[PDB]
Design a protein around this ligand. Sequence first.
Ligand SMILES: [K+]
Ligand SMILES: [K+]
Ligand SMILES: [Mg+2]
Ligand SMILES: [Mg+2]
Ligand SMILES: [Mg+2]
Lengths: 48, 367, 56, 123
Amino acid sequence: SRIINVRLISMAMTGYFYTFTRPRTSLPMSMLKYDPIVRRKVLFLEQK
Amino acid sequence: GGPELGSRRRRAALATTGNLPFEQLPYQCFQDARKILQQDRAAKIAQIVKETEKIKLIEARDASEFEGGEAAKQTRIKSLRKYIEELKILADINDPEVKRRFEDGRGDMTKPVYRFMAERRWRSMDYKIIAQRISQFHVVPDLLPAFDPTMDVKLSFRGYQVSPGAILDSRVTEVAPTLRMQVFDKGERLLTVVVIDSDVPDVTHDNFKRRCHFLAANIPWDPSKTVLSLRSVGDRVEGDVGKPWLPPFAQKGSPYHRLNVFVLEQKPGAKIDGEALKKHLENRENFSLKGFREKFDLEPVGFNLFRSEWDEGTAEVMERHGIPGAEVEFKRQKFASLKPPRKARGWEAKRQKPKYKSLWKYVKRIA
Amino acid sequence: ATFVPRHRRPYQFTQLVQLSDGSTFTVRTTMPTALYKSAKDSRNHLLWQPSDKSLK
Amino acid sequence: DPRIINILRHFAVLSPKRIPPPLRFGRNRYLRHWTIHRAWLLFRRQQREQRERILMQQHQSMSNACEELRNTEGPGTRETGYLYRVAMLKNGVYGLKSIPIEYASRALVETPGRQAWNHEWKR
RNA sequence: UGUUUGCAAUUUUUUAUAGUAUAUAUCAAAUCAUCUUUAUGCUAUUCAUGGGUACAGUAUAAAAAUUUAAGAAAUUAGGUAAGAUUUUGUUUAUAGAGAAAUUAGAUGUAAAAAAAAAAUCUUAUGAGGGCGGAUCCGCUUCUAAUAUUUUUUUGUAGUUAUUAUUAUAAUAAUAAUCAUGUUUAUUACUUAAAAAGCUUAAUGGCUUAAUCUUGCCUUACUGUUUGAUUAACAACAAAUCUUA
Ligand SMILES: [K+]
Ligand SMILES: [K+]
Ligand SMILES: [Mg+2]
Ligand SMILES: [Mg+2]
Ligand SMILES: [Mg+2]
């Protein structure tokens, strides 16, 4: 209940995602990850 | 007001200001601080004359007088001679123009003062990186048991200065490099330049061998010479070329090759025979710097590094010079498990033959 | 990457300190006063001048 | 509160962003500062070597007298070196009244006082 | 016209010229937000809101500024780079201050410089040593390097000063000596064990980093794959480490 599992959706609209955990009483996650569909580092943002 | 006078600021400041030496600027503190150093340099020069005349007295003195013989007389003149050198450097290390002349590159390197500051500049950064390249790239103990560089060596390929330990292309490293060597010691000595490739792969014996890519000797060098072109070693400058420059190459598959550019000093009055140097490399396919140095009594003084691996231009460079070995690729040796094959174990693994065809719904197509 | 801290120092003046004996010396201080006339000091304290009878 | 703001305004000026920036000298000025720097350090050497030379000479004089004093005898029927052994005693040297406060407290001053010296002092 | 106003001072690159690969200049970037009105106002004086005058290195009237401490707070833990290296406890002292509050402390040494002779091994991709079967293997002499000897010694100055003799100098002895460097010096080695710290108990480990601080980061990546855990758990599976 204290920790939630979020989904970091790629901003290349390729449908790839990364799942990381973070506390509810925190800000949304945002990272620069490697999208294997386009094979390039793009911006991944939390789903909601 | 042309480019021969300096920079735009100088050419500009040299036409709007007055003509007056920098030492004669009428500033209180600057002229009061130049008066302290003034009478100091007069006191140091007055000490060089007192220590100079003190050596003659010790020079024209029977060794029998000294309770220690001739051995105690050379150790007393040794400390005196060294004490004079420090006084010659301390007589101009505070001069404001000597610092300006050395920084502008117009300083005479035949004087101890300029060589003292030139050496204090090299050690500040350039020595540190080359001392690191020797250890990290395992030049020592691979090539030499121990090596502390004493002179600066900067090599440039076709004008562009290459940093120490940089993987260069097979086309860039196709012509003899130019060595920008600065020597901080007095006198003129003969310098021997040896470029050795220490990573030549020998597949027959499963090890690496050393191949010399360039060898020259009997190169007179003074602390006033800066540039040395390895192309004209026997045409313009005096020297004996044992082996001309060989284009570095590295076959596909093998790791990067290290090419070590070594500068070795010959002892005073020791000129390597032009025919005995070209005989050493005869029937020698594993050039050993250790043995070579011990035979000619040389001493390593300077060193620089640059690597070379397989690149697009490697194949074509071999064609021009006929270097054989282009159609040879190296693959990493694979070590398979040493465990003998064993029968599979488990309930499912046993019941995997046609005998248990009725139980194949539990044994086949398992995720 | 170690940071190189810069010194944070206030403005300083050169002050003349005239003790109770009339003697004057120069000091470096932050106060804006020019001359500090000291009526009471070690030169007018019995603990520092036990043999003086005028202060006794 | 108003007085406190006056205090904060003093610290706000000392903030790393408000204080002046690092100096920016040209070559001629920089070279001139180098000579001023070089001379000052040498000047300290001369003061240091001079101050250390006097300190050395004084110590040698004490050692000479002490070494000589150790070999002497007397006065009268006193064993050799009695005076040397008595001089090395440190009775009260590290006590509270070792050094008179008056002598130490008096210091050097740029200008003298109304009465530079008191000759009327009586025991 | 970014970069300090008196003049080729950092690195690399661009361009140009001379030049035959070098040399100088130039350009860009990195390092850094230094503040920029050449006077138009002020000041003094003088002369009728005003008009002059001032002559500037002892610079000047001629610009002292012209249109609410985060380096006082947050215990943020991973990749990488650099810097720091006993931080715990105990003990000593220290206004308020006490059994119990903060701060400062708490090992020692070195820094002019050695040369030379043989011996004992050990190593060497040293002499492509020699002999048996250039590199492999077994024998092996020679040189070189490290280590070791208490071994064989020789030298132990110079500089500053003192003392002694000698005719300010010379000689001998004695003491000091890291210092051309902003003394808060600096640099290297050394400073028992336990303890502190490292997400959490205990055990082991780390102080030469796995701790701490800071800069930039998010590889806490995708696919497949190697060798192991003396063939993980004395089977299988879920697992742990590791390679390309
Ligand atoms: K970090
Ligand atoms: K300890
Ligand atoms: Mg950690
Ligand atoms: Mg403590
Ligand atoms: Mg098993």
